[PDB]
Design an enzyme around this catalytic site. Structure first.
Site, mmCIF file in Angstrom:
data_model
loop_
_atom_site.group_PDB
_atom_site.id
_atom_site.type_symbol
_atom_site.label_atom_id
_atom_site.label_comp_id
_atom_site.label_asym_id
_atom_site.label_seq_id
_atom_site.Cartn_x
_atom_site.Cartn_y
_atom_site.Cartn_z
ATOM 1 N N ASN A 82 0.808 -1.244 0.000
ATOM 2 C CA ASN A 82 0.000 0.000 0.000
ATOM 3 C C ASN A 82 0.837 1.288 0.000
ATOM 4 O O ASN A 82 0.267 2.381 0.132
ATOM 5 C CB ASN A 82 -0.942 0.027 1.201
ATOM 6 C CG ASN A 82 -1.735 -1.242 1.367
ATOM 7 O OD1 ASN A 82 -1.669 -1.910 2.404
ATOM 8 N ND2 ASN A 82 -2.458 -1.620 0.315
ATOM 9 N N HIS A 129 2.947 2.280 2.293
ATOM 10 C CA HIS A 129 3.111 2.751 3.657
ATOM 11 C C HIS A 129 4.408 2.115 4.211
ATOM 12 O O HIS A 129 4.758 0.996 3.829
ATOM 13 C CB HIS A 129 1.899 2.324 4.507
ATOM 14 C CG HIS A 129 0.694 3.195 4.312
ATOM 15 N ND1 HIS A 129 0.415 4.233 5.170
ATOM 16 C CD2 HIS A 129 -0.240 3.183 3.331
ATOM 17 C CE1 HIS A 129 -0.684 4.806 4.705
ATOM 18 N NE2 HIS A 129 -1.116 4.208 3.602
ATOM 19 N N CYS A 182 5.511 7.395 9.728
ATOM 20 C CA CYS A 182 6.541 8.132 9.006
ATOM 21 C C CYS A 182 6.041 8.072 7.561
ATOM 22 O O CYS A 182 5.754 6.970 7.053
ATOM 23 C CB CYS A 182 7.909 7.465 9.145
ATOM 24 S SG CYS A 182 9.177 8.102 8.007
#
Ligand SMILES: O=C(O)c1c[nH]c2ccccc12
Lengths: 269, 268
Positions: free
Chosen positions: A190, A192, A227
């Site tokens: 995804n 991330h 982050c």
């Protein structure tokens, strides 16, 4: 891998690879954390849930809801050597409306001995607004049938290390590693940052002398904020203690916004 | 995994993991490169050679000699999807006194179709002085019995992409990613930066728009010098065109070259 006989847990075997081991020729804690994630993902697939790291139900997808890790706690007694077969058993349990918990037990496949254990706390969040929310009844009944009804804990003990509150490290830190940035290999499907990357970043500020003379026994990590792919992180560590203990803090390089806090316990080799 | 019937090659199956895939839900080229390394390591173990990535023989160990990669070339036709089983076959061949070559063939386990191929050139080096040297006869006979005697190439074709010379990118680069540093997870058991980390660093300077609209088909990488654990790297890329790019990795300070390479990308 396979669901066990009662269909309430999942087991899988892994052969430790050459690139998965550190200086001791045994698996790193990041390799262990990746295998925990892999077995969690195979368990969700086996019972029809989403396969993407968010383990969503049919109602969650419609409402744009996802599961996100709030805390990870891992204890390793023996790291498996390169070429060894490790068996990992995992299960999930609801904690009322607070969220869910996923637990794991790691065993040496040959001896049958428990070589490690882990527990993680997950919370429900709207993926667009990032707003946390309690678990509803409708979402809950959809996944209660895949969880044991009686409590099953990897850390049953009365005052276990998995539930201790973590304080905020105060400046100046004793050790630091600055300007840490994720690369594409640190991202999931995804886009991330993978949860295990934060473990690696925490460990970056431990001095090499500790890593050369000690073995990591316990790590507890809280996840406060993500982050982003274009963010920069500073990893801070202060000794709090034969055993050595440390307090950890990951924060954004610029404004100092907290992304994670944690503790580690190390035993002398 | 296992050595094949004639004992001159090694095969191993891998199930693609959830954390090993990218945005397309298929294995990344770094995951592929790690599996190539893993199958090479299992082949060396199966015939009694060293474990540590240097695949040393008894005479090499006494002389403090190691095998080091000089070039890696990988071509992927289809990246295996998450949950798919990929079978990888590997073998070695000596190239006289120049060094050795390790080749690989990747297949879809279900269909039996070739989904990828790779080749790598290895040179002998003294581990302490880091001085390159030709392969002696004594070291050679010890490993010739584990290599096929007739040539077996993953890239047989004449004037194939695996042997093309790579030029040096000239400043200014079109794209760059600066200040790349290895962390402990990037190191191998010997505390050296893993060869696959350099592939990731090369790819860091490719714009996200190319990565979103194209699939990486071919990557050729030369290894000139190693990045130490406390070094900082700059990744530089310029379009040379399908899309083709020229790559350069160099130390952040003095600009010392560590790698050069090329990539070829197909529009999705
Ligand atoms: O390590 C080496 O020198 C090797 C040369 N040919 C091989 C075949 C299988 C494993 C290692 C080697």
């Amino acid at each position: 891998g396979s669901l066990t006989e009662d269909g309430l847990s999942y087991k899988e075997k892994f052969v430790v690879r050459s690139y998965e081991v550190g200086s001791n020729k045994t698996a790193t804690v990041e390799t262990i954390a990746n295998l925990l994630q892999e077995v969690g993902c195979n368990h969700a697939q086996s019972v029809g849930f989403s396969t993407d790291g968010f383990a969503t139900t049919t109602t969650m997808r419609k409402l744009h809801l996802i599961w996100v890790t709030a805390r990870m706690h891992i204890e390793i007694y023996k790291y498996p050597a390169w070429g060894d077969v490790v068996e990992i058993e995992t299960w999930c349990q609801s904690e009322g409306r607070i969220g869910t918990r996923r637990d794991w037990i790691l065993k040496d496949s040959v001896t049958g001995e428990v070589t490690g254990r882990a527990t993680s706390k997950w919370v429900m969040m709207n993926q667009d607004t990032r707003r946390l929310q309690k678990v509803s009844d409708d979402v809950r009944d959809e996944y209660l049938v895949f969880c044991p009804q009686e409590p099953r804990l990897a850390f049953p003990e009365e005052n276990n290390r998995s539930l201790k509150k973590i304080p905020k490290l105060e400046d100046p830190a004793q050790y630091s590693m600055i300007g840490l940035k994720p690369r594409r290999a640190d991202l999931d499907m995804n886009q991330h940052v993978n949860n295990v990357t934060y473990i690696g970043w925490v460990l970056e500020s431990i001095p090499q002398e500790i890593v050369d003379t000690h073995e990591l026994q316990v790590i507890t990590l809280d996840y406060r904020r993500e982050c982003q792919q274009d963010d920069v992180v500073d990893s801070l560590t202060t000794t709090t203690s034969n055993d050595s203990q440390f307090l950890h803090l990951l924060r954004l390089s610029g404004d100092g916004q907290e992304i994670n806090r944690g503790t580690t316990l190390w035993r002398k080799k």
